[PDB]
Amino acid sequence: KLKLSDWFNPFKRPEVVTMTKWKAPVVWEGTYNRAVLDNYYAKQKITVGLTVFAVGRYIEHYLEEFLTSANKHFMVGHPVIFYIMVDDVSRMPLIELGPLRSFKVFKIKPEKRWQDISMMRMKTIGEHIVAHIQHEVDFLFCMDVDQVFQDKFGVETLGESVAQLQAWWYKADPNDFTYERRKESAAYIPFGEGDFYYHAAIFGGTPTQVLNITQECFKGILKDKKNDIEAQWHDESHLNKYFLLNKPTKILSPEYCWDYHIGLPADIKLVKMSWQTK
Amino acid sequence: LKLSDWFNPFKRPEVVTMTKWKAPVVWEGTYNRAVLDNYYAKQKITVGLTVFAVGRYIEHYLEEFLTSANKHFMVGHPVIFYIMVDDVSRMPLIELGPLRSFKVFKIKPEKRWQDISMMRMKTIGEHIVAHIQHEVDFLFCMDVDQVFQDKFGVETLGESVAQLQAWWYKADPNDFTYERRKESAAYIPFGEGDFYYHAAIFGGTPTQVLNITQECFKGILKDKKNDIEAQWHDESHLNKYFLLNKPTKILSPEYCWDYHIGLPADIKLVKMSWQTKEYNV
Ligand SMILES: O=c1ccn([C@@H]2O[C@H](COP(=O)(O)OP(=O)(O)O[C@H]3O[C@H](CO)[C@H](O)[C@H](O)[C@H]3F)[C@@H](O)[C@H]2O)c(=O)[nH]1
Ligand SMILES: O=c1ccn([C@@H]2O[C@H](COP(=O)(O)OP(=O)(O)O[C@H]3O[C@H](CO)[C@H](O)[C@H](O)[C@H]3F)[C@@H](O)[C@H]2O)c(=O)[nH]1
Ligand SMILES: [Mn+2]
Ligand SMILES: [Mn+2]
Numbered sequence: 303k304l305k306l307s308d309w310f311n312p313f314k315r316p317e318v319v320t321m322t323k324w325k326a327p328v329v330w331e332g333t334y335n336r337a338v339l340d341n342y343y344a345k346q347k348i349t350v351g352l353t354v355f356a357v358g359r360y361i362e363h364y365l366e367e368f369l370t371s372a373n374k375h376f377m378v379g380h381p382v383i384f385y386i387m388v389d390d391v392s393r394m395p396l397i398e399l400g401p402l403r404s405f406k407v408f409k410i411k412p413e414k415r416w417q418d419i420s421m422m423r424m425k426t427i428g429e430h431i432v433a434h435i436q437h438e439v440d441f442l443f444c445m446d447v448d449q450v451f452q453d454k455f456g457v458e459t460l461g462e463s464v465a466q467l468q469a470w471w472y473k474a475d476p477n478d479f480t481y482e483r484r485k486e487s488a489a490y491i492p493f494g495e496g497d498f499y500y501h502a503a504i505f506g507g508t509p510t511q512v513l514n515i516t517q518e519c520f521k522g523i524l525k526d527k528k529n530d531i532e533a534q535w536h537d538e539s540h541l542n543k544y545f546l547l548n549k550p551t552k553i554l555s556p557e558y559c560w561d562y563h564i565g566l567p568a569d570i571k572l573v574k575m576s577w578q579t580k
Numbered sequence: 581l582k583l584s585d586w587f588n589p590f591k592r593p594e595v596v597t598m599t600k601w602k603a604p605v606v607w608e609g610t611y612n613r614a615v616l617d618n619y620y621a622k623q624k625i626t627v628g629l630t631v632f633a634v635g636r637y638i639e640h641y642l643e644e645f646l647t648s649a650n651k652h653f654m655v656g657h658p659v660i661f662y663i664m665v666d667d668v669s670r671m672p673l674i675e676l677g678p679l680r681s682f683k684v685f686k687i688k689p690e691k692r693w694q695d696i697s698m699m700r701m702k703t704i705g706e707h708i709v710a711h712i713q714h715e716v717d718f719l720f721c722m723d724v725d726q727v728f729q730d731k732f733g734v735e736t737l738g739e740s741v742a743q744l745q746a747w748w749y750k751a752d753p754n755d756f757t758y759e760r761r762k763e764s765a766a767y768i769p770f771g772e773g774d775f776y777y778h779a780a781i782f783g784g785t786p787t788q789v790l791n792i793t794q795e796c797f798k799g800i801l802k803d804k805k806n807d808i809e810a811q812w813h814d815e816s817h818l819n820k821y822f823l824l825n826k827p828t829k830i831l832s833p834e835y836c837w838d839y840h841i842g843l844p845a846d847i848k849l850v851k852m853s854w855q856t857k858e859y860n861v
Contacts (some may be wrong), residue, residue, distance in 0.1 A: 333704040337699035347624055349658075381715065383681050391673050392673075394673070396668050396684050398683075398685060398686070399683040399711065400711070401681065401714050401715070402711070402714060402715060404681035404682060404683050404715075404823050405681060405682070405683060406676050406680070406681045406682070406699050407675070409675070431676065434677065434679070437677060437679065438658065438678070438681075441623075475728060478620065531860055
């Protein structure tokens with residue numbers, strides 16, 4: 303029974319978009335009250351889940367740093383469960399988790415093409431959601447492993463379906479977005495359409511919503527295959543297609559997934575997470 | 581939650597179902613897990629479980645303990661396995677099922693198995709204060725050299741839980757292997773004692789467990805200073821503690837049976853059995 307005006311103050315960040323045309327809030331540094339939210343959610347005793355895939359050298363190269371920084375910055379003060387999906391479990395790093403953090407490892411099959419490794423995540427996530435995640439967490443996030451938290455990534459990011467603004471295009475106009483522009487693809491988005499360009503490196507919401515998101519993207523990914531076509535940015539193309547039809551209830555600013563390669567403009571006040579120098 | 585709701589001793593008349601201080605003794609057939617699961621589910625309670633594996637005990641019992649726990653321990657409720665080992669690279673990563681999760685901790689290995697056993701008391705406490713108190717409603721501390729044979733459910737939860745030792749549940753208190761030397765802190769005089777509790781399983785709410793582990797380690801340290809060591813180590817201190825601070829619930833030998841004894845008519849359904857320690861032939 304939480305109201306937007308209870309934790310969100312868009313007037314703190316007037317230079318950027320704080321609200322979508324459909325009433326969905328865009329969380330920027332300085333517009334949220336994590337103190338209120340932490341109290342409100344704690345009273346509900348919610349549990350947050352976080353899925354992550356590490357296949358191949360992505361394990362030695364990123365998994366440890368991802369987990370160590372997540373244990374340190376992800377929803378601090380609230381129960382968290384990390385679902386590690388790897389192809390070689392005996393290579394997974396067992397870091398020491400802090401208060402309210404626990405994990406669970408799953409051995410998955412490694413896809414030959416790196417593209418399928420990225421896209422197959424959609425199918426796997428849905429299977430685990432149905433199998434157990436829906437019964438263990440109230441909110442779930444699905445992130446890339448080649449990222450690193452730099453600061454608090456709190457409950458101010460929770461919602462039915464949360465989307466992340468892609469660092470490079472958050473200020474570009476829709477007609478410039480790198481959407482899949484070929485009608486033969488299930489991810490096809492016609493010019494003159496589109497709200498924002500979402501990053502597939504971070505997305506989430508309630509187990510139910512994430513299931514629909516992952517289920518719908520996988521279908522489209524599968525359909526393109528039978529049609530011998532592949533979305534330009536793979537699952538990200540499908541994810542953007544999905545968020546167009548089913549708009550998110552909340553969007554995270556590029557501060558929750560910044561690419562230091564871009565530099566650090568005025569708009570980026572406090573980076574919560576950054577891309578790895580892959 | 582009233583005892584009348586789930587507990588019914590009329591089902592097992594041949595055995596003690598109630599202590600003198602009114603604590604119940606859970607036996608197969610006297611509990612209604614169905615009702616308790618409902619009450620406990622609505623409460624959104626999470627159950628914790630500590631376990632230690634140092635040296636050879638990792639390869640010989642850790643994997644079997646967790647696999648059987650993941651399958652039988654508090655099924656249908658959130659559970660967090662707390663694994664303490666001296667060598668993490670040997671930690672066997674088994675696939676956990678719905679409502680289970682865990683985290684491993686690297687602990688310093690002691691040079692005397694007796695110290696490994698007794699130190700668990702100190703380590704468990706430090707972890708209760710550090711994080712366990714903030715993650716679970718009930719916690720269980722078990723030996724690793726055992727395996728779950730069947731459902732070990734919420735019918736075992738309570739403020740402070742004690743396990744009856746399979747070999748003496750029918751023995752005379754004066755035959756118990758309590759520490760009989762008055763120079764030891766674990767000392768229990770002849771003519772005193774209710775039951776002989778198995779240190780292999782014990783639990784309760786984090787707070788209670790913290791007190792149990794704190795008081796036992798204190799006794800252990802005091803003995804080290806008086807150059808004396810309880811004949812049954814931490815188990816001796818635990819019995820002494822459970823004598824002074826009687827538990828709110830007790831588990832029949834069915835929750836921790838030794839097949840070497842065979843299988844008398846009292847053990848209706850084994851929930852957990854001891855793992856063998858040596859290959860005798
Ligand atoms: O060899 C690999 C390749 C990929 N991955 C997994 O797939 C994710 C995405 O792959 P990349 O990081 O290589 O892709 P990129 O940084 O280009 O990411 C963007 O584009 C991808 C599709 O190309 C996805 O949509 C992704 O979510 C989006 F952030 C990784 O984080 C990782 O969890 C592996 O585990 N091993
Ligand atoms: O080399 C060892 C020896 C012991 N332990 C740990 O200490 C526990 C207790 O040791 P044992 O199982 O070897 O002892 P035992 O079966 O004789 O157990 C009884 O006596 C013990 C003290 O001797 C404890 O009180 C214990 O709880 C009680 F059940 C083990 O399960 C294990 O978790 C190890 O990890 N490595
Ligand atoms: Mn990436
Ligand atoms: Mn033992």
